[PDB]
Amino acid sequence: ASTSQVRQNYHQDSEAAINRQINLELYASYVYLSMSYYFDRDDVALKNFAKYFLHQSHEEREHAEKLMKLQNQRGGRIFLQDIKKPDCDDWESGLNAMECALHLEKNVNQSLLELHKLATDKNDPHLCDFIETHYLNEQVKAIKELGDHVTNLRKMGAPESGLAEYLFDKHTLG
Amino acid sequence: ASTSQVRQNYHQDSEAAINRQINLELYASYVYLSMSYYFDRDDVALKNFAKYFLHQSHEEREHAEKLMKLQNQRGGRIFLQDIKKPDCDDWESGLNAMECALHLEKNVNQSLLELHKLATDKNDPHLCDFIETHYLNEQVKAIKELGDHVTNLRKMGAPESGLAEYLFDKHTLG
Amino acid sequence: ASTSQVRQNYHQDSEAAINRQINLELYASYVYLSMSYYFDRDDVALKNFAKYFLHQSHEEREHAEKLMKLQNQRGGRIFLQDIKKPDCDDWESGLNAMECALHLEKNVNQSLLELHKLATDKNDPHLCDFIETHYLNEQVKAIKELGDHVTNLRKMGAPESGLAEYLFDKHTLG
Amino acid sequence: ASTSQVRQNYHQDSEAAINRQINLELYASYVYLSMSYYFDRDDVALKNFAKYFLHQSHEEREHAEKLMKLQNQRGGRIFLQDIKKPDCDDWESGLNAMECALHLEKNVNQSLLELHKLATDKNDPHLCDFIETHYLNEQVKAIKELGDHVTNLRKMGAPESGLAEYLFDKHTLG
Amino acid sequence: ASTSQVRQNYHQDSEAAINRQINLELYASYVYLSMSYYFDRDDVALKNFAKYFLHQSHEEREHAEKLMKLQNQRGGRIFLQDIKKPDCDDWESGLNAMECALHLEKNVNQSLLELHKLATDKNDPHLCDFIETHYLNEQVKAIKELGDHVTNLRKMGAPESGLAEYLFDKHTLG
Amino acid sequence: ASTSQVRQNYHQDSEAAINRQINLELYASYVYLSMSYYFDRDDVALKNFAKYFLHQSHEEREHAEKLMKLQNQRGGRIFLQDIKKPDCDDWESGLNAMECALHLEKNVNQSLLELHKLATDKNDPHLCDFIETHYLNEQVKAIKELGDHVTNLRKMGAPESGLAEYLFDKHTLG
Ligand SMILES: [Cl-]
Ligand SMILES: [Cl-]
Ligand SMILES: [Cl-]
Ligand SMILES: [Cl-]
Ligand SMILES: [Cl-]
Ligand SMILES: [Cl-]
Ligand SMILES: [Cl-]
Ligand SMILES: [Cl-]
Ligand SMILES: [Cl-]
Ligand SMILES: [Cl-]
Ligand SMILES: [Cl-]
Ligand SMILES: [Cl-]
Ligand SMILES: [Cl-]
Ligand SMILES: [Cl-]
Ligand SMILES: [Cl-]
Ligand SMILES: [Cl-]
Ligand SMILES: [Cl-]
Ligand SMILES: [Cl-]
Ligand SMILES: [Cl-]
Ligand SMILES: [Cl-]
Ligand SMILES: [Cl-]
Ligand SMILES: [Cl-]
Ligand SMILES: [Cl-]
Ligand SMILES: [Cl-]
Ligand SMILES: [Cl-]
Ligand SMILES: [Cl-]
Ligand SMILES: [Cl-]
Ligand SMILES: [Cl-]
Ligand SMILES: [Cl-]
Ligand SMILES: [Cl-]
Ligand SMILES: [Cl-]
Ligand SMILES: [Cl-]
Ligand SMILES: [Cl-]
Ligand SMILES: [Cl-]
Ligand SMILES: [Cl-]
Ligand SMILES: [Cl-]
Ligand SMILES: [Cl-]
Ligand SMILES: [Cl-]
Ligand SMILES: [Cl-]
Ligand SMILES: [Cl-]
Ligand SMILES: [Cl-]
Ligand SMILES: [Cl-]
Ligand SMILES: [Cl-]
Ligand SMILES: [Fe+3]
Ligand SMILES: [Fe+3]
Ligand SMILES: [Fe+3]
Ligand SMILES: [Fe+3]
Ligand SMILES: [Fe+3]
Ligand SMILES: [Fe+3]
Ligand SMILES: [Fe+3]
Ligand SMILES: [Mg+2]
Ligand SMILES: [Mg+2]
Ligand SMILES: [Mg+2]
Ligand SMILES: [Mg+2]
Ligand SMILES: [Mg+2]
Ligand SMILES: [Mg+2]
Ligand SMILES: [Mg+2]
Ligand SMILES: [Mg+2]
Ligand SMILES: [Mg+2]
Ligand SMILES: [Mg+2]
Ligand SMILES: [Mg+2]
Ligand SMILES: [Mg+2]
Ligand SMILES: [Mg+2]
Ligand SMILES: [Mg+2]
Ligand SMILES: [Mg+2]
Ligand SMILES: [Mg+2]
Ligand SMILES: [Mg+2]
Ligand SMILES: [Mg+2]
Ligand SMILES: [Mg+2]
Ligand SMILES: [Mg+2]
Ligand SMILES: [Mg+2]
Ligand SMILES: [Mg+2]
Ligand SMILES: [Mg+2]
Ligand SMILES: [Mg+2]
Ligand SMILES: [Mg+2]
Ligand SMILES: [Mg+2]
Ligand SMILES: [Mg+2]
Ligand SMILES: [Mg+2]
Ligand SMILES: [Mg+2]
Ligand SMILES: [Mg+2]
Ligand SMILES: [Mg+2]
Ligand SMILES: [Mg+2]
Ligand SMILES: [Mg+2]
Ligand SMILES: [Mg+2]
Ligand SMILES: [Mg+2]
Ligand SMILES: [Mg+2]
Ligand SMILES: [Mg+2]
Ligand SMILES: [Mg+2]
Ligand SMILES: [Mg+2]
Ligand SMILES: [Mg+2]
Ligand SMILES: [Mg+2]
Ligand SMILES: [Mg+2]
Ligand SMILES: [Mg+2]
Ligand SMILES: [Mg+2]
């Protein structure tokens, strides 16, 4: 029951919201892992799409670990939940995977914006600064990058043009 | 429906057993992640226990990735399931965590031995060699290491001796 | 007549099966040599297809040499047969050559799997280990690579698109 | 009485067979030590024969140590027996010593093949892989090398030609 | 049917004669491969004879490849035939193998001299220069080397003297 | 029967005493090998005790080899006997093993002192110098080191204190 010796200005609602965000980052890690190995299939065979999404996957795990570190720094207690399987097994195309990644990153951003609103409501400037420093601009850059990629693949003629996804794999992701 | 152009001598039962093993490796990764951050709590504060279990966690993710690579190499299709949360939130002590890790690694080994029996039953010598090369001796070394650690912590007087877990953290894990 | 001073646990059927496999590896070497120089024709002119298949050809010769070394290591006696000319003089296209190479590598794999079954039947664990160590995973990687290449060429629009085979030559094989 | 915390899938018969093999490797070490110092006698005086057999002797000790390490890795218990003196004090000639070494290495190989059959019978794929990885191909190479040496010494005119054993000592073992 | 865009002054008889020579070079490659592994037998065991003939074998493959390159350079079309097994399985002795290699190299030279006569008859100075530059002096050097080796082995007392072949292996081929 | 051409001032009793000492050094090597792998057990798990005794074991083998070299230098003839298994399978504790090693080294020293008395009685100053140079001060240093180790382990509270043996392993043997 008794309070952590380190805990100060750290609301129970913020503690719970941080545990929810840890789960979402691990979910995103899992989604990108699934997408990566789709592109390693012998009937898809786009190795730089596979490498790009595997790197994305490793970055999400790092995002989760930093939130776990934060939870302990502030004297909250980590509570883990199941990591749900991704919505899709078959990602259809390079373009569709990039569109799904854009959607994932905007949903993660919306979660972080809700987290920041809560930290603002509870007058937790350390937690506001943590989210702003480590997460919000990373999300803005990730979303911009994925939008750029979706744009190029559409302009090149994906997903009908297998030549488009092949040349994008070599010139943008390679 | 139609068969992968690469698939040869790769039974549907082996394909399914590989997907089950991918889930178990990701589960083990999650268990070690949970254990790691327990030792980063301000009321536990054993930083080399935390580092040791985080490294274990990263190794399990690599074990899962190599099985995903194998699935595609042989022309099977990855099917992911939810990654269950670990059995414990509170791991009690350095000794208890090490005993739980020993139990986890023996359960993963038993799964791999069942997988090898199936590959033997289906006359899949490539899959037998894959399991023997990349997994069986890694498990034997992991189990031996964890047994050694449990032995030292017990002999030192853990878990009642907080001095024992502190000195083990510095001299064996540091 | 009299037995080799080194021979131990090496069945006459295994000895004969090794000589058959030596011939098949030299045949595969010859098939890839033929394919290589097709791409060096002035009316085909895909230099990285030519280089890729020449390297394949040199690797098959190395596969044959290692089996010849094995035969002598175990005290069997090499018996050579004619190396048959390849089935084709004209390989039609980059895509068709890659499809023929995939077929060749799956036939060589099937031969090696029959060889392993025989070594298992004759309780020859050294020969089983030799095949697993030096051949089975090399075949699995070769087949996966060729499947990936066939997939990309088809998606790019080969064989009708001469642009597809030209750009594949530069970006994947170059 | 109670079971090792590490032990899994490790039959008592395999444990005993490993202890027998440890003794045989130490015996082989002793045989090669005896042979080495025969060639250091002032009335034999073949220094590269002496060096060759001393290196052989050190390799057998390493073979024994790795089996001792395996016994503990799998949670079996080492049981040592007397190391019998070699069959001979006087090895007669370079050729006779090489013929005795060929016989020793084939007997050690036969022991390892019996060990592998037992591990196969007890469905111990880790132990099968251990024997295949560390022992079976080392034996095949050792036996082939000794056969080659016996062949050269016989062709040169040993053991009647002291010139043959002298020139072999310099050109093959030196 | 229609003519290569590159073809100029290249008679159909020269084109056919080049295909015959490609087969003979691949045959010679095969003969030297067979001879090499004879010397790797445990009951022959002359490792520098084995290395010498393996290098010879690799040089013949290079001779064949350069003729394949020539065929395409001049706009002819490669036509491959079966590579016949060597005349012998058992080469008897170092001296006999060297005598067989001398005979092989003189037969290859006679083929090249017939090829040059044809190129002269068809007023093909490029093909005459190609044969003179890349083949005729290589044959003269190869034949002289093999004659020197046969001479030394005979003078040393081969094939009855196993000491002769052993010392030649070390001092000339080593 | 007839005498070695090198033999001078080398009594048959000294020759026999040297063969007895060769056996005792090989016995000591075996005792330290057994002790080493006791500390590699998963239920003992003191890796620097294991390393220390393995090094001791290798030093005893070197002691035996130097006596074998001496036997031949002086024109005596090596006669080997069985190497008896150690008195213990289970060495109980770090302290007990160190006490057993102290006892072993004092027994080996007593043997060497008897050997020196015999060499003195037979007026063999070369053999006296050999024993003094290579053995007597090595024994005195070994005995002093083991006494120091026994003293520290007792003062630290071994064998009841598992913490004592763990910290000794790290700070003295590590
Ligand atoms: Cl608070
Ligand atoms: Cl609160
Ligand atoms: Cl990464
Ligand atoms: Cl605030
Ligand atoms: Cl940023
Ligand atoms: Cl940006
Ligand atoms: Cl920015
Ligand atoms: Cl391009
Ligand atoms: Cl299949
Ligand atoms: Cl199936
Ligand atoms: Cl790591
Ligand atoms: Cl099988
Ligand atoms: Cl391993
Ligand atoms: Cl280990
Ligand atoms: Cl190991
Ligand atoms: Cl046999
Ligand atoms: Cl047979
Ligand atoms: Cl190459
Ligand atoms: Cl078997
Ligand atoms: Cl491989
Ligand atoms: Cl691969
Ligand atoms: Cl691989
Ligand atoms: Cl068991
Ligand atoms: Cl049992
Ligand atoms: Cl050595
Ligand atoms: Cl098995
Ligand atoms: Cl090996
Ligand atoms: Cl070999
Ligand atoms: Cl080898
Ligand atoms: Cl023309
Ligand atoms: Cl013409
Ligand atoms: Cl070469
Ligand atoms: Cl002319
Ligand atoms: Cl030249
Ligand atoms: Cl010359
Ligand atoms: Cl010249
Ligand atoms: Cl004397
Ligand atoms: Cl005397
Ligand atoms: Cl050492
Ligand atoms: Cl004296
Ligand atoms: Cl000293
Ligand atoms: Cl001292
Ligand atoms: Cl001193
Ligand atoms: Fe994230
Ligand atoms: Fe794992
Ligand atoms: Fe300390
Ligand atoms: Fe091959
Ligand atoms: Fe051995
Ligand atoms: Fe040639
Ligand atoms: Fe000693
Ligand atoms: Mg959620
Ligand atoms: Mg990202
Ligand atoms: Mg709480
Ligand atoms: Mg669900
Ligand atoms: Mg989507
Ligand atoms: Mg910033
Ligand atoms: Mg950052
Ligand atoms: Mg499961
Ligand atoms: Mg691990
Ligand atoms: Mg399916
Ligand atoms: Mg649940
Ligand atoms: Mg537990
Ligand atoms: Mg291994
Ligand atoms: Mg590995
Ligand atoms: Mg065939
Ligand atoms: Mg290949
Ligand atoms: Mg035969
Ligand atoms: Mg035909
Ligand atoms: Mg085909
Ligand atoms: Mg096997
Ligand atoms: Mg392998
Ligand atoms: Mg290889
Ligand atoms: Mg025995
Ligand atoms: Mg050896
Ligand atoms: Mg027992
Ligand atoms: Mg006896
Ligand atoms: Mg003998
Ligand atoms: Mg191997
Ligand atoms: Mg080894
Ligand atoms: Mg011909
Ligand atoms: Mg030549
Ligand atoms: Mg034509
Ligand atoms: Mg014929
Ligand atoms: Mg001939
Ligand atoms: Mg010239
Ligand atoms: Mg040249
Ligand atoms: Mg004694
Ligand atoms: Mg000592
Ligand atoms: Mg005597
Ligand atoms: Mg006894
Ligand atoms: Mg004792
Ligand atoms: Mg004195
Ligand atoms: Mg001194
Ligand atoms: Mg000394």
Author numbering:
A (entry chain AAA), B (entry chain AAA), C (entry chain AAA), D (entry chain AAA), E (entry chain AAA), F (entry chain AAA): 3 to 176
Manuscript text:
The SDS-based disassembly/reassembly protocol was used to encapsulate the metal compound Ru1 within the human H-ferritin using a 200:1 metal complex to hHFt cage molar ratio. Since CD spectra cannot provide indication on the correct cage reassembly of the Ru1-hHFt system, the X-ray structure of this system was also solved. The structural analysis indicates that the overall conformation of hHFt in the Ru1-hHFt system formed in SDS is very similar to that of hHFtSDS and of the untreated protein. Notably, analysis of the electron-density map reveals that the Ru complex is not directly coordinated to the protein, neither on the inner shell nor in the outer shell, as observed when another Ru complex has been encapsulated within the horse spleen ferritin nanocage. To confirm the presence of the Ru complex within the Ru1-loaded hHFt system, crystals of Ru1-loaded hHFt and of hHFtSDS were dissolved and analysed spectrophotometrically. Notably, the spectrum of dissolved Ru1-hHFt crystals does not show signals between 400 and 450 nm. The origin of this difference in the spectra is unclear, but it suggests a modification of the Ru compound structure inside the hHFt crystal, that alters its absorption properties.
In eukaryotes and in some bacteria Ft is made-up of 24 subunits that naturally self-assemble to form a nanocage structure. The cage has octahedral symmetry, with external and internal diameters of 12 nm and 8 nm, respectively. H chains exert ferroxidase activity and have a high affinity for the TfR1 transferrin receptor, over-expressed on the surface of different cancer cell lines.
